[PDB]
């Protein structure tokens, strides 16, 4: 998993040397920013079904053509799996808010996603539009704190730039 600890022990293992002062200095900042990212992750965990419901209809509101026959959102089985995949992506974002890095995103949602979405005829723009809608409905004092919103929108922009 790409995180703060793993990068520096992997670098020290590649160099074959003991943990120096720079490695521990990198963990002090993890201690600092965990006060914001953990209470971002907790607020995402406590209210996730509202956000997954709210961002799911923005996809079909922007792209109403998916419910036509021949498309990828015809019957209820496709829309249910659409909501399930959006919930999967929100869970991976909650995981990356906890681990401190983009590890769980890069390995459980991003790597290999392009071949699946091209093969199974899933348009990536509508997998993107839900994440884009989720980012813009984030006010600074209401939904979370100030740094928690920065920490949340950074992972949202990472997922958006990965799928686009």
């Amino acid at each position: 998993m790409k995180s703060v600890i793993t990068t520096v022990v992997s670098a020290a293992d590649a160099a074959g040397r003991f943990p120096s002062n720079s490695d521990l200095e990198s963990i002090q900042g993890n201690i600092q920013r965990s006060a914001a990212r953990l209470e971002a992750a907790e607020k995402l965990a406590g209210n996730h079904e509202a956000v997954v419901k709210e961002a799911g209809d923005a996809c079909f509101a922007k792209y109403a053509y998916l419910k036509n026959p021949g498309e990828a959102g015809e019957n209820q089985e496709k829309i249910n799996k659409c909501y399930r995949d959006v919930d999967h992506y929100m869970r991976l974002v909650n995981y990356c808010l906890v681990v401190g890095g983009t590890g769980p995103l890069d390995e459980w949602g991003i790597a290999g996603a392009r071949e699946v979405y091209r093969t199974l005829n899933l348009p990536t723009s509508a997998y993107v539009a839900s994440i884009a809608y989720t980012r813009d409905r984030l006010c600074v004092p209401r939904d979370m704190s100030a740094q928690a919103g920065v920490e949340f929108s950074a992972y949202l922009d990472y997922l958006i730039n990965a799928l686009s």
């Binding site: 992997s10 590649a14 160099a15 459980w108």
Partner: protein
């Protein structure tokens, strides 16, 4: 850890997590005069890959002493550095001068190319060059064929790829990879299949037959078996290990047939009793109850769970189970 779930991945806890992390790509054509630790990383990574985690003393590391110096300004990382250090005495002493030729060949495939030889023609294309032209064209044949520049960037260190799909190999070669590469704490002197004098794949690589994958650090990881013939034409001797065949009538009598490999057998603990038998022990002949550890079985399907109980109540440890 072990498994395939709980990480959503299989290849790392197959013993490959250190090899899934490093690249060591050497981003610049020559040395920065002034600066000598971003290459010491590269040179030591090269030493751990090319010598295959064999350990080089400072006395033996100072025998190169010019190659590395020539590498710092006027050689490539991949070609012409790993090429020149395969020609040295420190490589030849532990990879060519104690093994036979096909063994010195299939060790060079792992060190230089990062995979295993596929079949007999991979062996014959490389031993022909040795018998015509000597050791140096033999070692350069690993570099100046088509594969090496196709696979590897000119400044990257060679990496392990014998497990990978996109190296167009046979799938028996996927499983010959883990005969030779067992985790990250193994050199080739450290392999039980190769004592720096044996051939790791001798029957199994020529005949392309596949060999069941025991993950390292597992519970019955310590399994090791010989090879002996079984017929009268080759003057073989029956009874050593079970065949990987399931040939005749009991292959379906008692269902689907399997091949279980059991590694730890010893005299204390046979009876239904959680302890030793007290007495003189052994037998009038003076042999153990199991005269060999590392015994294999060929077993049915309705017969599988009583065999499981008979293994584990007598101190045995199951190394592997593969269906036939």
């Amino acid at each position: 850890r072990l498994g395939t779930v709980s990480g959503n991945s299989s290849l790392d806890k197959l013993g490959l997590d250190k090899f899934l992390s490093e690249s060591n790509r050497a981003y610049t054509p020559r040395a920065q005069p002034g600066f000598s630790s971003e290459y010491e990383q590269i040179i030591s990574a090269t030493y751990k890959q090319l010598f295959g985690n064999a350990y080089i003393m400072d006395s033996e590391r100072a025998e190169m002493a010019k190659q590395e110096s020539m590498f710092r300004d006027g050689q490539l990382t991949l070609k012409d550095f790993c090429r020149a250090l395969a020609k040295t005495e420190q490589y030849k002493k532990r990879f060519f001068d104690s093994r036979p030729l096909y063994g010195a060949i299939e060790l060079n495939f792992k060190n230089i190319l990062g995979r295993t030889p596929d079949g007999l023609e991979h062996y014959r294309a490389k031993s022909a060059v040795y018998d015509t032209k000597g050791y140096e064209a033999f070692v350069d044949a690993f570099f100046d064929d088509g594969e090496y520049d196709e696979v590897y960037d000119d400044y990257t260190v060679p990496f392990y790829r014998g497990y990978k799909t996109e190296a167009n190999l046979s799938m028996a070669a996927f499983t010959h990879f883990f005969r030779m590469v067992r985790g990250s704490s193994t050199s080739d002197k450290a392999n039980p299949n190769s004592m720096q004098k044996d051939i790791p794949l001798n029957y199994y690589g020529i005949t392309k037959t596949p060999l069941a994958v025991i993950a390292p650090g597992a519970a019955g990881t310590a399994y090791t078996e010989s090879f002996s013939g079984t017929g009268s034409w080759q003057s073989g001797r029956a009874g050593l290990n079970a065949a990987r065949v399931a040939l005749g009538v009991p292959a379906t009598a008692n269902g689907k047939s399997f091949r279980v490999e059991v590694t730890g057998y010893t005299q204390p603990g046979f009876g239904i009793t959680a302890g030793t038998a007290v007495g003189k022990l052994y037998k009038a002949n003076k042999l153990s109850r199991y005269p060999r550890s590392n015994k294999s079985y060929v077993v049915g399907f309705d017969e599988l769970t009583p065999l499981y109980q008979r293994i584990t109540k007598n101190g045995g440890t199951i190394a592997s189970i593969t269906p036939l």
